[PDB]
Amino acid sequence: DSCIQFTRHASDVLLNLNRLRSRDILTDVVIVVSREQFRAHKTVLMACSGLFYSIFTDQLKCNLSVINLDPEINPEGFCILLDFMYTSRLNLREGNIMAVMATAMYLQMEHVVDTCRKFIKASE
Amino acid sequence: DSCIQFTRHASDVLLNLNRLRSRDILTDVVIVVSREQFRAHKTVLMACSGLFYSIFTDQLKCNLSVINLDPEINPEGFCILLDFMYTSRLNLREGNIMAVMATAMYLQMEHVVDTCRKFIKASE
């Protein structure tokens, strides 16, 4: 086509989706990770995660307002990945890298799994 | 903070939101523009438009499944702007620029209004 493109548009959209998440606006699901609860938008979760994409395209699960994750999932690892989904920024640290990588593998977030593998390999 | 950032994350999220829109997945509103109907995600519309942001933060309108736009709004202009919201690409042409600019002013999409003004000024 002969379209023009606004470079900062995708980043501006994601910034506003994060602002709606912070103010709890039009969030339509609560993700339960052991004792912890995280409110989010189903569309953003599907757009970022192979696991959520599979869950919310399922004819019965698409209508659930609560999703319970596997008890082995660490709430902090999930929180870090949820923040990444809404911001593009990953808070990866020596003390959380193992939990973040295991959570990213479970959530099917291949780019996160890739950088965790590289950061671990460098420390070996 | 000490976060790392994935450069293509925002663009990848927007690409997936557009794929969900094309397959009509988790769309929660129909925008009526005279005889034409457009299905979309309320969160994406709010993230892109000052008008939709105001409508869907309103305690009564947030629950509507149908929104009717002003009869002066051109369906093609709306279609072009909806495509822009989901892709960052604006199909701006001599034959549609006046309708696109008027629709962007109504929808409160200031960056689109800005480029339409500049393209018009250059042709004068």
Partner: peptide, 4 residues
């Protein structure tokens, strides 16, 4: 704005 750019030419993509």
């Amino acid at each position: 704005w750019v030419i993509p």
